Write a protein that binds this ligand. Structure first.
Ligand SMILES: OC[C@H]1O[C@@H](O[C@H]2[C@H](O)[C@@H](O)[C@H](O[C@H]3[C@H](O)[C@@H](O)[C@H](O[C@H]4[C@H](O)[C@@H](O)[C@H](O[C@H]5[C@H](O)[C@@H](O)[C@H](O)O[C@@H]5CO)O[C@@H]4CO)O[C@@H]3CO)O[C@@H]2CO)[C@H](O)[C@@H](O)[C@@H]1O
Ligand code: ZN
Length: 472
């Protein structure tokens, strides 16, 4: 059977299923309704930055259509919806004056969700730093971001927190650090060679440190001011792809473990244990900022749950560790990526070149966190795959590969949960085809097809798969 034995009965009582979007990727009205620009508006409006010179000005127009989209998610039997608030739609300059029209939108969206029995899971930040803060403060390079972010979070808690009980601060700070400040391919386009300036060896570490301090400060504000009355939770969303040793050699096993530590441990060791991974301290040395005892104690235990975005897996090959002139965060790991073993690829690729379909990576990641970090409450906050550009509507709708993807990945998630992993929920990326950052509209991740000419929504086979799997 096409469900392959999956249903709500196959998961724990009260396990949460949802779909996910992010503000810039779906809302549209990017320069309307009082919204100020983000670093993504500026970046996407520069010729050559995004596929087809596309941008999120209109995107899926969820701003106008949100009731349609909520009706659709309810009809597909989801329990929850993860979306983000655009900082610059609330505070067009990132601080100071509140855009009341922006506030009204999120009130309307949250209220409709609740009216329809869909639980809002709300991200405060999803790459979309207000342009004004980038220009005035230097963005995430500036330790002052902790104060600026805390003040924004405080406003959101006060304004929405009587209704919203599930918050996330950040989405994938690793990718902000990597793409914004190591490779310089996402805004602010910083790197050692980059026109904007930068230093691929130092800035990714400064940026990560500031995300951690900002998360901790926002959570401290929630707990001391709002939580007694509101009784909600705040976590963080971190990407984690699985790393498997290419062989059972000491060097390959060490390499895979180094990759895990530089990828997820970078954030989870501070959040769970109050320090960076030992290997990162050993290899990165004075380029890795030091938490004071007070900061470390603020960061430790500051996530009520850990969101994990899980997509893919790689093999890892290792080498003797060597003294080397620092060049970048990526090069600091001293590992070699490998995508085949015994002459067989680890899995076929989706439309995105980085996205290898490897369902057992889901089990890898979930098991690893359970065993290493004392089984923290985890929520799978994104999982999904993409179709390419230029298909016909019907080809988009017959998304047989995506159906297989969800059945296989969720089977592997079920295996990990059945072995005792503390996973509380699962969210599909994405509800809708949307603006996929550098890929623009050339990458289709949705379980619902969006015709980008007419803006019409049409559920794909994977949407109906979820509907069948999730019927109550
Ligand atoms: O995209 C859907 C949805 O997901 C969330 O964010 C995504 C994000 O959009 C993607 O950009 C990001 O992609 C990263 C991959 O997950 C990650 O595996 C990949 O790793 C690179 C690595 O950075 C790179 O150094 C490495 O290069 C090696 C070469 O492969 C070798 O041949 C060469 O010899 O050596 C170099 C380095 O030693 O390769 C791998 C790629 O295979 O990096 C990607 C970024 O480039 O994934 C995110 C999720 O993990 C987001 O929430 C949503 O908004 C978004 O729409
Ligand atoms: Zn519209």
């Amino acid at each position: 059977n096409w469900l392959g034995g999956l249903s709500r009965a196959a998961f724990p009582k009260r396990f949460v299923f949802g779909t996910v979007t992010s503000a810039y990727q779906v809302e549209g009205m990017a320069a309307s309704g009082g919204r100020g620009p983000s670093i993504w508006d500026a970046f996407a409006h520069t010729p050559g930055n995004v596929a087809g010179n596309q941008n999120g000005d209109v995107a899926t127009d969820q701003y106008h259509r949100y009731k349609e989209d909520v009706n659709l998610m309810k009809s597909l039997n989801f329990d929850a919806y993860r979306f983000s608030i655009s900082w610059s739609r609330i505070f067009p300059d990132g601080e100071g004056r509140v855009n009341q029209e922006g506030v009204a939108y999120y009130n309307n969206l949250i209220n409709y969700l609740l009216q329809k029995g869909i639980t809002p899971y709300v991200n405060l930040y999803h790459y979309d730093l207000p342009l004004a803060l980038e220009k005035k403060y230097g963005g995430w390079l500036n330790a002052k971001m902790a104060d600026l972010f805390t003040e924004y979070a405080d406003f959101c808690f006060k304004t929405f927190g009587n209704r919203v009980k599930h918050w996330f601060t950040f989405n994938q700070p690793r990718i902000v650090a990597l793409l914004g400040y190591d490779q310089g391919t996402n805004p602010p386009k910083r790197c050692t060679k980059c026109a904007a300036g930068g230093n691929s060896a130092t800035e990714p570490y400064i940026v990560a440190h500031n995300f951690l301090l900002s998360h901790a400060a926002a959570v401290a504000r929630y707990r001391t001011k709002y939580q007694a009355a509101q009784q909600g939770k705040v976590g963080i969303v971190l990407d984690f792809n699985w790393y498997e040793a290419l062989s059972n050699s000491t060097e390959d096993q060490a390499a895979a473990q180094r990759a895990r530590d530089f990828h997820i441990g970078w954030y989870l060791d501070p959040l769970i244990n109050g320090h960076y991974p030992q290997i990162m301290q050993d290899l990165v040395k004075d380029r890795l900022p030091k938490f004071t005892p007070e900061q470390a104690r603020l960061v430790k235990g500051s996530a009520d749950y850990i969101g994990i975005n899980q997509y893919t897996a790689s093999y890892m090959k290792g080498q003797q560790l060597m003294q080397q002139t620092p060049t970048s965060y990526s090069a600091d790991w001293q590992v070699t990526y490998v995508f085949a073993k015994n002459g067989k690829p680890i899995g076929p690729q989706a439309n995105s070149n980085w996205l290898y379909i490897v369902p057992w990576g889901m089990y890898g990641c979930v098991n690893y966190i359970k065993q290493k970090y004392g089984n923290p409450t985890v929520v799978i906050t994104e999982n999904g795959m993409d179709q390419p550009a230029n298909l016909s509507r019907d080809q988009y709708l017959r998304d047989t590969t995506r159906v297989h993807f969800y059945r296989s990945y969720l089977t592997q998630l079920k295996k990990a949960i059945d072995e005792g992993a503390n996973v509380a929920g699962y969210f599909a990326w994405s509800l809708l085809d949307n603006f996929e950052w550098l890929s623009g509209y050339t990458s289709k991740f949705g379980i619902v097809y969006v015709d980008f000419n007419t803006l019409e929504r049409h559920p794909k086979a994977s949407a109906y798969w979820f509907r069948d799997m999730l019927k109550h």
